[PDB]
Amino acid sequence: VAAVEFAKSPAEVLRVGSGFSLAGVDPESTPGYTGVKADGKALLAAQDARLAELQEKLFAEGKFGNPKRLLLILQAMDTAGKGGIVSHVVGAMDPQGVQLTAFKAPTDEEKSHDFLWRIEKQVPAAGMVGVFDRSQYEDVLIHRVHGWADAAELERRYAAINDFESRLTEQGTTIVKVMLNISKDEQKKRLIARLDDPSKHWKYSRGDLAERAYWDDYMDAYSVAFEKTSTEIAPWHVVPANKKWYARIAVQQLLLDALGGLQLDWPKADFDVAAERALVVES
């Protein structure tokens, strides 16, 4: 089967705008996409080639003094498929052009700095695509749910995040923020599937069952986070993810459309080609 492209851009239908509410989102929908799974798998393979070309241009431009770069931020509940999306996106790219960080629980060194210190260290360099599997937002989600910071601190964190994203954008970074949204039942279906497949027992974590008890608090944290931190220069996008195939192509199209907005082309030679060709031909 052949590539059915998005009918409407996900920068548009998946954006968190002034209207937004996270309960209006259906985790089963495929917004902007009129094809089905077979069509999506075929789009995905085309997307990969497109992404490889456009990242390679970002990189080439960066090697020649362009300051532009890109930062993909993924947040989602466990099971929602961040790992798989990260792996897919990174694997479509040249790894020497990508800076992936999967933020784990903070180290003691990290806990003794402001919450952005560890994040700022990892922002992508010129010409790079940075991928954040989890991000600075962890510090207004898990911490909120579990009362590990008061309404005041949370408020300051929201403002710091926005100031941070604003600094990065001014320095050249296009920030693509994605939340992968699965339903509370989809998570259950997924944890059960880990227990039913022996190949997946090594991944099962009791910790994921623990936190189901806090599921609606997490949805609230997210929704507040989006009211606070979805801006014109760094919009949030919430991508229905109950269908893995759809989330993959929605994340990828977001990336391609962000990269296509940068007007990347291949650098001209900084030397004389005709002459250099002759030198090689005599080499």
Added chain:
Amino acid sequence: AVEFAKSPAEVLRVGSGFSLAGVDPESTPGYTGVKADGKALLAAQDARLAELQEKLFAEGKFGNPKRLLLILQAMDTAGKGGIVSHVVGAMDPQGVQLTAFKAPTDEEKSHDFLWRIEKQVPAAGMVGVFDRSQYEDVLIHRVHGWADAAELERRYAAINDFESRLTEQGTTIVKVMLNISKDEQKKRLIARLDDPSKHWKYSRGDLAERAYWDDYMDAYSVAFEKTSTEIAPWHVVPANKKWYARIAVQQLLLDALGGLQLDWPKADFDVAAERALVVES
């Protein structure tokens, strides 16, 4: 799925009788299929690589000390970055530690040559990939030639001890040199000049590599004589046919992982009880 007739660990290995001069960079040793067959074998190899790497990692997470280090050396133009790209893309990047070694920083030049290499070796459960490596330090551009040959000899020996320690710690070391002809190198440079989308990539440096081509070939031969050991053999991969180099490198890697006898870890808890507990949440 046309597979390897003979395993590349046999036919591509650097043993007792070895001569770089006798390697034909246009051959496809151990393989009897043609481009279209190699291209489908690769597609198959990717899925196998994904599974074996994930098993390596799962075992590591549960306290297995086994890991893998792929070391790739090659002249520029020879496909090394491309192959690294493809092999890493077949794996989950959180299970991979890729380092592309460049010219030493001043901090690095003030330590022994291995200090910086040591920093980057893979953890338990990880596949490490070295795009260039410790071998660069016994090639011509960081030697003062053989004016102090004692230093060089020291280095080959350092490299063996290092690879011996890593293997004692649990690393399977897979070492590959991609080998192209001098004429193929010319062809690929010229192609870089004839394709405006590759201009960014062209380096006058590589034309200098041409002048000293035979000298690089000799440095690699001495390297293979001195550091192809039983625990860390060298393999030389004809690479004028990119498609073959790709399937040879992965196959080396598949075979090495395959020899570690990996499986998925067993759950250390009552699966049935937990499932019930999940069902009631």
